[PDB]
From Swiss-Prot, chain A:
Protein name: Serine protease subunit NS2B
Topology term for the membrane: Multi-pass membrane protein
Organism listed in the record: Zika virus
Region (Interacts with and activates NS3 protease): 4-38
Domain notes from UniProt: The central disordered region transitions to ordered by binding to NS3.
Location in the cell: Host endoplasmic reticulum membrane
Full-protein positions shown: 1418 to 1455 of 3419
Residue numbers on the Cytoplasmic membrane side: 1-38
Region of interest: Disordered: 8-30
Functional summary from the UniProt entry: Required cofactor for the serine protease function of NS3.
Oligomer and partners: Forms a heterodimer with serine protease NS3. May form homooligomers. Interacts with human SPCS1. Interacts with non-structural protein 2A.
Length: 38, 153
């Protein structure tokens, strides 16, 4: 059995850590809900 | 507890208490990714949440009502993943989304890598609205991860 427990409000944080790039990727979404690179 | 906010999805059919994913409670509806619960009922305190709508291809599922989240990435601005990793505090990570180009159109994507149990963490815009859920993506050359910004209708 699964159960849920609260972890916080949904809010933007002004002092947030910034990271990650912004790649543009050709992808396909199959019937199973899996993305794949094209 | 139906208070709006982000929630961990836990199970104990494993060793100890394991966090299998994350979700968003808004307007009395719990939102998460399909691969987190596979559509199973959920317990919240003394009450039970039953699945209401789900779609394996979108990898989304909602409990107690139809999908409520309808904000979308503007295309131009940075966003924040409110990552809720297992055993760790909710943490905002700001990023400029990339793009999944598909036959049917373009989807925002974030190049952030977290444990599998982070699946379902919300991504937010600057006005605080949830523009999608984290956790359905691809693995690129490097070997790390890019998740779609998965939003329902
Ligand atoms: C725990 C750890 N990290 C990761 O798993 C991922 N980070 C990374 N891999 N760098 C981050 C996961 C974030 C949460 N999201 C998921 O769990 C979803 C659940 C599937 C729903 C698909 N409907 N999985 C995915 O989105 C992608 C889809 C790939 C589709 C391609 N056709 N699958 C994987 O990464 C599995 C994997 C591949 C290589 C190597 C590994 C794991 C080894 N690493 C690990 O085990």
């Amino acid at each position: 059995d699964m159960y849920i427990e609260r972890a916080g409000d949904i809010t933007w944080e002004k002092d947030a850590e910034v990271t990650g790039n912004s790649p543009r990727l050709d992808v396909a979404l199959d019937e199973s809900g899996d993305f794949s690179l094209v | 507890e139906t208070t709006d906010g982000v929630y961990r999805v836990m199970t104990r059919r494993l060793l100890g208490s394991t966090q299998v994913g994350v979700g968003v409670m808004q307007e009395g509806v719990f939102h998460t990714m399909w691969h987190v619960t596979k559509g199973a009922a959920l317990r919240s305190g003394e009450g039970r949440l039953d699945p209401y709508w789900g779609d394996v291809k979108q990898d989304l599922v909602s409990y107690c009502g139809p999908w409520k989240l309808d904000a979308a990435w503007d295309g131009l601005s940075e966003v924040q993943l409110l990552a809720v990793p297992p055993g760790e505090r909710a943490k905002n990570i700001q990023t400029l989304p990339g793009i999944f180009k598909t036959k049917d159109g373009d989807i925002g994507a974030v190049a952030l890598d977290y444990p599998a149990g982070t699946s379902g963490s919300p991504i937010l815009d600057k006005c605080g609205r949830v523009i999608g859920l984290y956790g359905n993506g691809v693995v690129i050359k490097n070997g790390s991860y890019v998740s779609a910004i998965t939003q329902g209708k």
